Scaffold this active site. Structure first.
Site, PDB file in Angstrom:
ATOM      1  N   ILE A   1     -18.918  14.658  25.438  1.00  0.00           N
ATOM      2  CA  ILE A   1     -18.052  15.084  26.569  1.00  0.00           C
ATOM      3  C   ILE A   1     -16.729  14.324  26.457  1.00  0.00           C
ATOM      4  O   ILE A   1     -15.662  14.922  26.687  1.00  0.00           O
ATOM      5  CB  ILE A   1     -18.765  14.825  27.894  1.00  0.00           C
ATOM      6  CG1 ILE A   1     -20.069  15.622  27.980  1.00  0.00           C
ATOM      7  CG2 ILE A   1     -17.834  15.135  29.054  1.00  0.00           C
ATOM      8  CD1 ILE A   1     -21.007  15.138  29.071  1.00  0.00           C
TER       9      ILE A   1
ATOM     10  N   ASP B   1     -16.803  -1.905  23.875  1.00  0.00           N
ATOM     11  CA  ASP B   1     -18.273  -1.925  24.071  1.00  0.00           C
ATOM     12  C   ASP B   1     -18.552  -2.311  25.528  1.00  0.00           C
ATOM     13  O   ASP B   1     -18.287  -3.461  25.898  1.00  0.00           O
ATOM     14  CB  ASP B   1     -18.904  -2.900  23.098  1.00  0.00           C
ATOM     15  CG  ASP B   1     -20.401  -2.800  23.085  1.00  0.00           C
ATOM     16  OD1 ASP B   1     -20.961  -2.283  24.081  1.00  0.00           O
ATOM     17  OD2 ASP B   1     -20.985  -3.242  22.073  1.00  0.00           O
TER      18      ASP B   1
ATOM     19  N   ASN C   1     -16.996   7.387  31.211  1.00  0.00           N
ATOM     20  CA  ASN C   1     -17.822   8.417  30.534  1.00  0.00           C
ATOM     21  C   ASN C   1     -18.848   7.759  29.621  1.00  0.00           C
ATOM     22  O   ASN C   1     -19.997   8.218  29.670  1.00  0.00           O
ATOM     23  CB  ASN C   1     -16.990   9.429  29.767  1.00  0.00           C
ATOM     24  CG  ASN C   1     -17.852  10.209  28.801  1.00  0.00           C
ATOM     25  OD1 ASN C   1     -18.470  11.176  29.212  1.00  0.00           O
ATOM     26  ND2 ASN C   1     -17.928   9.766  27.544  1.00  0.00           N
TER      27      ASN C   1
ATOM     28  N   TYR D   1     -32.984   5.511  32.341  1.00  0.00           N
ATOM     29  CA  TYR D   1     -31.771   6.365  32.372  1.00  0.00           C
ATOM     30  C   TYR D   1     -31.492   6.786  33.822  1.00  0.00           C
ATOM     31  O   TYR D   1     -30.364   6.573  34.343  1.00  0.00           O
ATOM     32  CB  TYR D   1     -31.872   7.594  31.459  1.00  0.00           C
ATOM     33  CG  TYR D   1     -30.659   8.487  31.592  1.00  0.00           C
ATOM     34  CD1 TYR D   1     -29.401   8.040  31.233  1.00  0.00           C
ATOM     35  CD2 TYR D   1     -30.750   9.749  32.151  1.00  0.00           C
ATOM     36  CE1 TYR D   1     -28.266   8.822  31.400  1.00  0.00           C
ATOM     37  CE2 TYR D   1     -29.632  10.554  32.306  1.00  0.00           C
ATOM     38  CZ  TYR D   1     -28.386  10.084  31.940  1.00  0.00           C
ATOM     39  OH  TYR D   1     -27.302  10.886  32.095  1.00  0.00           O
TER      40      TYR D   1
ATOM     41  N   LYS E   1     -28.507   5.653  36.582  1.00  0.00           N
ATOM     42  CA  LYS E   1     -27.497   6.575  37.167  1.00  0.00           C
ATOM     43  C   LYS E   1     -27.611   6.502  38.705  1.00  0.00           C
ATOM     44  O   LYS E   1     -26.560   6.658  39.394  1.00  0.00           O
ATOM     45  CB  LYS E   1     -27.624   7.974  36.549  1.00  0.00           C
ATOM     46  CG  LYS E   1     -27.225   8.109  35.077  1.00  0.00           C
ATOM     47  CD  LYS E   1     -25.772   7.656  34.792  1.00  0.00           C
ATOM     48  CE  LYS E   1     -25.253   8.054  33.421  1.00  0.00           C
ATOM     49  NZ  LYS E   1     -23.816   7.729  33.291  1.00  0.00           N
TER      50      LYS E   1
ATOM     51  N   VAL F   1     -25.738  19.203  28.246  1.00  0.00           N
ATOM     52  CA  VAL F   1     -24.763  19.534  27.161  1.00  0.00           C
ATOM     53  C   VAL F   1     -25.437  19.506  25.789  1.00  0.00           C
ATOM     54  O   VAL F   1     -26.249  18.610  25.559  1.00  0.00           O
ATOM     55  CB  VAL F   1     -23.529  18.604  27.183  1.00  0.00           C
ATOM     56  CG1 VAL F   1     -23.889  17.153  26.925  1.00  0.00           C
ATOM     57  CG2 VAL F   1     -22.474  19.046  26.181  1.00  0.00           C
TER      58      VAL F   1
ATOM     59  N   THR G   1     -28.947  25.322  33.132  1.00  0.00           N
ATOM     60  CA  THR G   1     -28.693  25.753  31.730  1.00  0.00           C
ATOM     61  C   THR G   1     -27.946  24.658  30.976  1.00  0.00           C
ATOM     62  O   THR G   1     -27.321  23.798  31.625  1.00  0.00           O
ATOM     63  CB  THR G   1     -27.792  26.992  31.603  1.00  0.00           C
ATOM     64  OG1 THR G   1     -28.082  27.894  32.670  1.00  0.00           O
ATOM     65  CG2 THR G   1     -27.943  27.707  30.274  1.00  0.00           C
TER      66      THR G   1
HETATM   67  N1  LIG Z   1     -25.465  15.054  27.771  1.00  0.00           N
HETATM   68  C1  LIG Z   1     -25.831  15.573  28.938  1.00  0.00           C
HETATM   69  O1  LIG Z   1     -26.342  16.701  29.038  1.00  0.00           O
HETATM   70  C2  LIG Z   1     -25.639  14.737  30.142  1.00  0.00           C
HETATM   71  C3  LIG Z   1     -24.971  13.534  30.030  1.00  0.00           C
HETATM   72  N2  LIG Z   1     -24.639  12.789  31.135  1.00  0.00           N
HETATM   73  C4  LIG Z   1     -23.665  11.650  31.052  1.00  0.00           C
HETATM   74  O2  LIG Z   1     -22.434  12.119  30.544  1.00  0.00           O
HETATM   75  C5  LIG Z   1     -21.792  11.063  29.780  1.00  0.00           C
HETATM   76  C6  LIG Z   1     -21.505  11.558  28.383  1.00  0.00           C
HETATM   77  O3  LIG Z   1     -22.734  12.075  27.767  1.00  0.00           O
HETATM   78  P1  LIG Z   1     -22.725  12.618  26.238  1.00  0.00           P
HETATM   79  O4  LIG Z   1     -21.326  12.902  25.767  1.00  0.00           O
HETATM   80  O5  LIG Z   1     -23.720  13.729  26.131  1.00  0.00           O
HETATM   81  O6  LIG Z   1     -23.268  11.319  25.477  1.00  0.00           O
HETATM   82  P2  LIG Z   1     -23.312  10.872  23.931  1.00  0.00           P
HETATM   83  O7  LIG Z   1     -24.501   9.965  23.791  1.00  0.00           O
HETATM   84  O8  LIG Z   1     -23.169  12.071  23.049  1.00  0.00           O
HETATM   85  O9  LIG Z   1     -21.961  10.020  23.845  1.00  0.00           O
HETATM   86  C7  LIG Z   1     -21.928   8.822  24.646  1.00  0.00           C
HETATM   87  C8  LIG Z   1     -20.621   8.103  24.422  1.00  0.00           C
HETATM   88  O10 LIG Z   1     -20.749   6.771  24.997  1.00  0.00           O
HETATM   89  C9  LIG Z   1     -20.453   5.846  23.984  1.00  0.00           C
HETATM   90  N3  LIG Z   1     -21.174   4.603  24.180  1.00  0.00           N
HETATM   91  C10 LIG Z   1     -22.529   4.394  24.107  1.00  0.00           C
HETATM   92  N4  LIG Z   1     -22.868   3.135  24.232  1.00  0.00           N
HETATM   93  C11 LIG Z   1     -21.654   2.475  24.373  1.00  0.00           C
HETATM   94  C12 LIG Z   1     -21.332   1.118  24.548  1.00  0.00           C
HETATM   95  N5  LIG Z   1     -22.221   0.128  24.602  1.00  0.00           N
HETATM   96  N6  LIG Z   1     -20.023   0.824  24.681  1.00  0.00           N
HETATM   97  C13 LIG Z   1     -19.114   1.809  24.630  1.00  0.00           C
HETATM   98  N7  LIG Z   1     -19.294   3.103  24.423  1.00  0.00           N
HETATM   99  C14 LIG Z   1     -20.605   3.372  24.331  1.00  0.00           C
HETATM  100  C15 LIG Z   1     -20.829   6.539  22.673  1.00  0.00           C
HETATM  101  O11 LIG Z   1     -20.288   5.774  21.580  1.00  0.00           O
HETATM  102  P3  LIG Z   1     -21.138   5.626  20.209  1.00  0.00           P
HETATM  103  O12 LIG Z   1     -20.718   6.821  19.382  1.00  0.00           O
HETATM  104  O13 LIG Z   1     -20.607   4.340  19.662  1.00  0.00           O
HETATM  105  O14 LIG Z   1     -22.655   5.578  20.478  1.00  0.00           O
HETATM  106  C16 LIG Z   1     -20.206   7.899  22.952  1.00  0.00           C
HETATM  107  O15 LIG Z   1     -18.785   7.886  22.813  1.00  0.00           O
HETATM  108  C17 LIG Z   1     -22.730   9.846  29.880  1.00  0.00           C
HETATM  109  O16 LIG Z   1     -22.382   8.983  30.957  1.00  0.00           O
HETATM  110  C18 LIG Z   1     -24.084  10.536  30.081  1.00  0.00           C
HETATM  111  O17 LIG Z   1     -25.103   9.690  30.594  1.00  0.00           O
HETATM  112  C19 LIG Z   1     -25.223  13.105  32.340  1.00  0.00           C
HETATM  113  C20 LIG Z   1     -26.118  14.059  32.434  1.00  0.00           C
HETATM  114  C21 LIG Z   1     -26.155  15.133  31.460  1.00  0.00           C
END
Ligand SMILES: NC(=O)C1=CN([C@@H]2O[C@H](COP(=O)(O)OP(=O)(O)OC[C@H]3O[C@@H](n4cnc5c(N)ncnc54)[C@H](OP(=O)(O)O)[C@@H]3O)[C@@H](O)[C@H]2O)C=CC1
Ligand SMILES: NC(=O)C1=CN([C@@H]2O[C@H](COP(=O)(O)OP(=O)(O)OC[C@H]3O[C@@H](n4cnc5c(N)ncnc54)[C@H](OP(=O)(O)O)[C@@H]3O)[C@@H](O)[C@H]2O)C=CC1
Lengths: 223, 223
Positions: B13, B58, B85, B154, B158, B187, B189
């Site tokens: 996202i 981080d 995010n 998780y 949240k 991501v 439905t």
């Molecule tokens: N995916 C979904 O369907 C849903 C997601 N969400 C929330 O939406 C947001 C984005 O989800 P999504 O894009 O799918 O997640 P991804 O796991 O695909 O991406 C997560 C992002 O967070 C970064 N990240 C993880 N750990 C750290 C850290 N310690 N420090 C800094 N950056 C970090 C990742 O970096 P790196 O590449 O280094 O791991 C990446 O850029 C999150 O808050 C998630 O919980 C909520 C509900 C539904």
């Protein structure tokens, strides 16, 4: 015979609950303190009512929690009613003004602590009859109540454990467990440690359904 | 001329949000990655779109959080829209099967990180015009939605961040901040991250009310 377990029994509501169960004939009580040698009132309670067993537990201390099962296993093959009472309440007010160590402490003590405690004692609860599981929460931990106060790491930690309590209730329903989050009241409207305890013992005995969030009077709270 | 801040912009996202923002005129974007050197798609975005600035973060790391304000400050004098995010989702299913380390990691990354990150970036935000503060949360964090799934650490993380978001909305209303928790959709439905990003960016620009728990489509979720 029923076996009750109460964390944080050296003072406050914990002590009062144990004090009331000692008066109930045929109740064994596993009561905990982090420093049982300095628990003057409790150690007295237990010499005069030796159905009261005083065990060491620091719920913020994983090494303490790694021993709670054998410590309890010295006195009982089962727990009927589990009460996660021991908790902290040190941090209120704004987020911008709540430092790191405060967030960390309430999490470790108020969330992880009870979750690990429960994980350890689950086997002893499972062999008991009542299969009743009480996490003493707070009304401040509701996502749907406005007291006109900020509860900072305190509230967040009660809300976090409430989330996990709700899930646990769902997950243990097939095993016939009764799992509740209970606000014991606000104690010294303020109510006495003895008043909170009396209501909690009634509720402990009377609760027949799982997944509730209850105040001490037995009325429901919104999660 | 608006600055946005997006944590976790190397993929998912976050990347789609930075990509969507980089297409609008007058939008400077401070995008973060744990490891910018390997953030191929993001770095190529930035190489062509100089309004996109990449910085290391981080959120699990206090020593990385201790640097984000001074480092963001090299590229901007203010943030209009803060988007927390970056996050993890590694722990699901029953409470008894979730080891200690999953509870901890989800607290530090998903609760303390964003909270600390907000604390460090608040001044920059106070100095901007929009004063908009978005926490990407999950419908899985609601204390009042049942999906017949266990979300373990998780979901707990949240819910905890939701509690603290609602409190922050109350605290910063006098300073005319807009604070929201936002479910970005499911991501892959299911919606795509590019659909999520389109919707989210719409929401970020239009939301003029604080204290909301919202879904990507602008509809409300219960806390
Ligand atoms: N995916 C979904 O369907 C849903 C997601 N969400 C929330 O939406 C947001 C984005 O989800 P999504 O894009 O799918 O997640 P991804 O796991 O695909 O991406 C997560 C992002 O967070 C970064 N990240 C993880 N750990 C750290 C850290 N310690 N420090 C800094 N950056 C970090 C990742 O970096 P790196 O590449 O280094 O791991 C990446 O850029 C999150 O808050 C998630 O919980 C909520 C509900 C539904
Ligand atoms: N009474 C109230 O105003 C309200 C209370 N509650 C809840 O009621 C419960 C009881 O609170 P209350 O009696 O007021 O608390 P107290 O302030 O009296 O002390 C808390 C209790 O927990 C023990 N304890 C604290 N930290 C630890 C630890 N790390 N390991 C083990 N034991 C520990 C204390 O022992 P020690 O002496 O060593 O500190 C004591 O027994 C808590 O869950 C609280 O959140 C909820 C709603 C409001």
């Amino acid at each position: 015979e029923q076996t009750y377990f109460i964390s944080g029994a050296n003072r406050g509501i914990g002590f009062s609950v144990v004090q009331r169960l000692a008066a109930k004939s045929g109740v064994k009580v596993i009561a905990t303190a982090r420093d049982p040698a300095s628990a003057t009132a409790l150690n007295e309670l237990a010499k005069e009512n030796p159905q009261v067993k005083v065990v060491q537990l620091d719920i913020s201390d994983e090494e303490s929690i790694k021993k709670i099962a054998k410590n309890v296993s010295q006195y009982t093959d089962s727990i009927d009613v589990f009460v996660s009472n021991a908790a902290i309440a040190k941090s209120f007010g704004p987020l911008l003004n709540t430092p790191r160590e405060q967030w960390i402490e309430h999490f470790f003590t108020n969330v992880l602590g009870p979750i690990r405690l429960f994980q350890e004692l689950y086997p002893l609860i499972k062999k008991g009859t009542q299969k009743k599981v009480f996490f003493i929460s707070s009304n401040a931990g509701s996502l749907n109540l406005d007291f006109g106060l900020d509860f900072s790491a305190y509230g967040q930690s009660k809300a976090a454990l409430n989330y996990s309590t709700k899930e646990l209730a769902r997950q243990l329903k097939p095993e016939n467990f009764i799992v509740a989050a209970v606000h014991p009241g606000v104690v010294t409207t303020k109510i006495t440690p003895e008043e909170s305890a009396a209501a909690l013992c009634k509720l402990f005995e009377s609760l027949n359904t799982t997944g509730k969030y209850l105040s001490y009077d037995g009325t429901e709270l919104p999660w």
